[PDB]
Amino acid sequence: QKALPASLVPQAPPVLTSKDKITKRMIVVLAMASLETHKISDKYVLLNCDDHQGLLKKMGRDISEARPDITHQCLLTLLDSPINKAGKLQVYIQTSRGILIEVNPTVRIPRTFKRFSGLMVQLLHKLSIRSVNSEEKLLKVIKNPITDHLPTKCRKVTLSFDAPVIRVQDYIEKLDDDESICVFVGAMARGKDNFADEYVDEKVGLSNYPLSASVACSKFCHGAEDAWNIL
Amino acid sequence: PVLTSKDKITKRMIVVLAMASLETHKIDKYVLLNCDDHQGLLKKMGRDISEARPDITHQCLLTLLDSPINKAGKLQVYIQTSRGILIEVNPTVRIPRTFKRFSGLMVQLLHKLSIRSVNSEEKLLKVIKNPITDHLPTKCRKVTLSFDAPVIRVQDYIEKLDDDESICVFVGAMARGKDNFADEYVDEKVGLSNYPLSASVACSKFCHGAEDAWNIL
């Protein structure tokens, strides 16, 4: 009936940067990420709930607010999800102190939190992290606000418990043909969802039961993949 | 309600982590074996450095027990270590969110052979006897997530399953090796995605497809 494409050789899909304003994609912003480096005596360490209770108490900040493991496991989930391998996913990290980090989809986050902590310390002090094979910057610290770097036609939602429950596949289907989706997920233990009220169009909920941030990211990614037939 | 191994009737989702790396070593101090903490000791023991990875099992446990299907109560989790030690995980327990606390709780579980709750009415984590066929319910279908198997849609597979028939999924928490960890147990082998998947993503995909099929929203 219809002619085949000239080459059926499989090709790697293009990787999406903030330079590409046009391409439809899924974007996850891990907001209120607890990523702060502090100097001991002399060792610079990323602040931890388990290993730095004395330092957190001395500085007066609550120990439950120092959770970078949530950001770590959310990065693992997002970057290991099939939508990232298909090349239709972008990840930004919005720390609680106001730092904005762009994650290149080709980076491999170390599976262990110790190596993740060392990588985050070097990223937060050197402002960029390159790769071993080629010197392309896999992690970058970029200028606020996020809406400068976001695609031009993008729909912005916050994942919240109080918002009405939606179906992710139906939402992504209801999106336009040229419009991208941006999802703000609070990468924090216990807060309330004011972190992105200046940016977002609306707040949506994923389930009646409470969810962790990794489960919320995984659910929205799975809905996006079934809506876009990635699999 | 709470699903237990004693129940043999209710249609449920059994997830069996297989070839999990859960090793206790004496140094006395009893420590869980992970490669970054023990680079030299694993090399002295001569086993593979990439084999000792409890973090995979920890991440899979976090995703499974924070999944909404566990909140509804349809899910049940077993952990078959590489040694052969088989663990039943209660749906009510909250696994520690950090790896060091998880390692401590694994050391306590593997040495005491049981973990008792504060209320002590039941056991949060239990060591049960080989095999798993005795503890899984009567009418059940057993599948292995494998890459070379044909790719299926999880929702369609679960709706093709019967009304009184449970599903059992063997997910390899092993880092490297073949998919033959449970071939003699399982009914068949299914593929979830065209791309290779981490065990956490495989558990998340199959759980979320199960929720969409069983209307657990």
Binding site: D80, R108, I109, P110, R111, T112, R115 | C35, D36, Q39, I49, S50, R53, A175, R176, P196, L197, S198, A199
Partner: peptide
């Protein structure tokens, strides 16, 4: 290249 291999050690 890497398929859940994990980042290589030093």
């Amino acid at each position: 290249t890497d398929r859940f291999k994990g980042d290589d050690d030093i």
